[PDB]
Design a protein around this nucleic acid. Structure first.
Ligand code: K
Ligand code: K
Ligand code: K
Ligand code: MG
Ligand code: MG
Ligand code: MG
Ligand code: MG
Ligand code: MG
Ligand code: MG
Ligand code: MG
Ligand code: MG
Ligand code: MG
Ligand code: MG
Ligand code: MG
Ligand code: MG
Ligand code: MG
Ligand code: MG
Ligand code: MG
Ligand code: MG
Ligand code: MG
Ligand code: ZN
Lengths: 132, 25, 98, 68, 215
RNA sequence: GGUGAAAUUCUUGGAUUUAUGAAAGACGAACAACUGCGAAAGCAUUUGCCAAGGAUGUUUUCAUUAAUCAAGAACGAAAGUUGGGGGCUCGAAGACGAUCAGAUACCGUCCUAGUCUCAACCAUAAACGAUGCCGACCAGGGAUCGGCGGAUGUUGCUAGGACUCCGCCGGCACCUUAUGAGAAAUCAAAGUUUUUGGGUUCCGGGGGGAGUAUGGUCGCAAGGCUGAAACUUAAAGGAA
């Protein structure tokens, strides 16, 4: 029930970890999932689930599925792992966002929604940290 | 040997003496 | 041999400073000793601004920025090249570089 | 001023003015009394003519005080 | 397949804002033991104030709208709090200045229990030479005391509708900045966040006061 | 999910992911600094209450009442001990998955004590400025924190606050310099020392054996405090 020209906005929750990438599209309330493609669904090796190439493929599948449901615009909510873990988005965030823009989807308001503690629980690894 | 671990070795050795001497009292 | 007048940290007239956890490895480090860098960059990389700006759904919209404060332990700052080993004379220069 | 460009026995009246009251060649107070009924310049009591503070008491704009 | 049995609904904003076409949301069609209206009720929608107000200057503020009723195909929402965007707050918090925050729980005339969060920063003078503009802890407590006092007065008197009308122009932020100037000059005085702790039980009569006949 | 790569592990009985809400316990980000307070340990969300404190100001008061301290006392991170509460997170020990010639490790997954709190113990840390306390004197310079004095014209402000300029006292520090000192590194004190003496406490006498044995004493224990000798050795060590 959308006339030509009108934009039907969805919300794309992009979770770009350093081990995998999620491209989860919902409605404005985030309570109705439309499509959810992860980088692990587009590669065979675990080492490539977070790669930008895997994120590009996942974004192309999300864009195609959105057009079927009448969604042509997306709000972007990017996040890293957050909490007491890394706050830096993974290597698939830029690739996923660029791929959506190059598939007919009109990008709306972009926002970073990484969970930031206002203090926090103790981080893993011990006081000497991860020793490599 | 690292001084901390040499200190640990001596303390273990003192416990045994403390126990090897109180055994006969 | 004492290498630095500040002892490698920044603490005067106080006993204890609570530690922070290295952003890279999670090592505990006193806040006054950790190497701190405040990174501000566009949430969209320069390699994708053109594509995202063309697909914008608003006549006007300023792309937000990404604010991240990074706190490194000494080992990670040197390994990641955030800081480098300097000569004995250059160690005293406290002004940030160009 | 350099040590040899000054006379310790006859310092300028402006130099001793800004020195600490206890470090002058002869100790001298910076306080004084004034009329309005005498009032101490650094009064610790509420006279409302003067309001005590951490230094000189805050005088009132209305009345005029004469140093003595 | 599953999406073939979902009906789209239009989201309507209260009369306080300009643009009422918030957006669209879907839900599974009404089926036995799963009523469609029950699935949409109390759905929270977070939409930028630049969309509701059609003003790009308000892009930094987000509005929480929750669905109260479902009349036909329209979902009637109501104000359910507001907050800053993550980028906005991170741009205001800078080194070499003092940050002052305050919160207060207040009840409006409509029995709405709110928790308003205020934020402010110390401001340099044009001729200031020293690099920092820190305030003394005693001054901070005096400023924080006036933030709380002003926030109570503005919310304890007005209703929720009239209170929200003050958040759009940030009238409360200007009054705080005008009362605390005698203590310490402040900049970027905002109501950072508003929470709804206890809302009165639903009453359709009051809901339609801020909503028109979308028929 | 996790890694260099993996696997243990979770998962169509719906995991991971998204929205809303609740509970629990911990933590108190950004602001946050060559900044503050405290005897040290240490101390960081708001507001109230309680006692305490430095500095500044003072034409107030007492009038040597002081400095340092055997004995003897108070406090003393973390870990640990006893019992109660709590038990999110993380996590010695343990188990498992990897890696490896082996891997009781480093990396990964799960987890006990512990981590938090109350009552009671323990009294040790690179408890470091590796520099005991009190006093005098001896270069320069800017910044900064607290208080006060003076000058000055601006504030979407209610004389004052905010800022600007000059100065005084006190504090955390920093910068330049040697006329100084030093084995040097370096230090404005670590200077005013063969031109050797202001006062006082503690404490060292080549390297090991050894903070060990023994006796005493404290502790529930772990251990703490006190503390040798035989014997061995021509170096060990500091700075450059
Ligand atoms: K440092
Ligand atoms: K004790
Ligand atoms: K000073
Ligand atoms: Mg390494
Ligand atoms: Mg060395
Ligand atoms: Mg101090
Ligand atoms: Mg310490
Ligand atoms: Mg002030
Ligand atoms: Mg402070
Ligand atoms: Mg805080
Ligand atoms: Mg004694
Ligand atoms: Mg203790
Ligand atoms: Mg000791
Ligand atoms: Mg010592
Ligand atoms: Mg002593
Ligand atoms: Mg000492
Ligand atoms: Mg001052
Ligand atoms: Mg020097
Ligand atoms: Mg002598
Ligand atoms: Mg000897
Ligand atoms: Zn690190």
């Amino acid at each position: 029930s959308v006339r030509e020209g009108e934009l039907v906005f969805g919300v794309a929750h992009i979770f770009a970890s350093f081990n995998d990438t999620f491209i989860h599209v919902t409605d404005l309330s985030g309570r109705e999932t439309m499509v959810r493609i992860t980088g692990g669904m587009k590669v065979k090796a675990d080492r490539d689930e977070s790669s930008p190439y895997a994120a590009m493929l996942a974004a192309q599948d999300v864009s195609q599925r959105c057009k079927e449901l009448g969604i042509n615009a997306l709000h972007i909510k990017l996040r890293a792992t957050g909490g007491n873990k890394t706050k830096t988005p993974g290597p698939g965030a830029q690739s996923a966002l660029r791929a959506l823009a190059r598939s007919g989807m009109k990008i709306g308001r972009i926002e970073d929604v990484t969970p930031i503690p206002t203090x926090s629980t103790r981080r893993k690894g011990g006081r000497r940290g991860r020793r490599l | 040997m690292r001084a901390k671990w040499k200190k640990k070795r001596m303390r273990r050795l003192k416990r045994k003496r403390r126990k090897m001497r109180q055994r006969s009292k | 041999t004492f290498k630095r007048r500040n002892g490698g940290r920044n603490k005067h007239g106080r006993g204890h400073v609570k530690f922070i956890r290295c952003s890279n490895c999670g090592k505990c480090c006193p806040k006054d000793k950790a190497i701190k860098r405040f990174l501000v960059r566009n949430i969209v990389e320069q390699a994708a601004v053109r594509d995202v700006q063309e697909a914008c759904a608003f006549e006007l919209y300023t792309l937000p920025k990404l604010y991240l404060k990074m706190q490194y332990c000494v080992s990670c700052a040197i390994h990641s090249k955030v800081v480098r080993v300097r000569s004995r004379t250059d160690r005293r220069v406290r002004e940030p570089p160009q | 001023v350099l040590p040899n460009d000054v006379d310790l026995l006859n310092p300028p009246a402006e130099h001793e003015k800004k020195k600490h009251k206890l470090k002058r060649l002869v100790q001298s107070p910076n306080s004084f009394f004034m009329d309005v009924t005498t009032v101490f310049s650094h009064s610790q009591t509420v006279v409302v003519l003067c309001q005590p503070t951490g230094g000189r008491a805050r005088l009132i704009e209305g009345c005029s005080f004469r140093r003595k | 397949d599953p999406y073939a049995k979902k009906d789209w609904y239009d989201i309507k904003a209260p009369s306080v804002f300009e643009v009422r076409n918030v957006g669209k949301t879907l839900v599974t069609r009404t089926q036995g033991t799963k009523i469609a209206s029950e699935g949409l009720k109390h759905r929270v929608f977070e939409v930028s104030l630049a969309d509701l107000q059609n003003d790009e200057d308000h892009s930094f503020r987000k509005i929480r709208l929750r669905a109260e009723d479902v009349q036909g195909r329209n979902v009637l929402t109501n104000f359910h709090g507001m907050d800053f965007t993550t980028d906005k707050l991170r741009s205001l918090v800078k080194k070499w200045q003092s940050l002052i925050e305050a919160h207060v729980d207040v009840k409006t005339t409509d029995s709405y229990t709110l928790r308003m969060f205020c934020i402010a920063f110390t401001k340099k003078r044009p001729n200031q030479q020293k690099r920092t503009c820190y305030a003394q802890s005693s001054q901070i407590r005096q400023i924080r005391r006036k933030m709380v006092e002003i926030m109570r007065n503005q919310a304890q008197s007005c209703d929720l509708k009239d209170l929200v009308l003050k958040f759009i122009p940030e009238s409360i932020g200007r009054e705080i900045e005008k009362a605390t100037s005698s203590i310490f000059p402040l900049q970027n005085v905002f109501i950072r966040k508003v929470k709804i702790l206890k809302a009165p039980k639903f009453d359709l009569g009051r809901l339609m006061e801020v909503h028109g006949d979308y028929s």
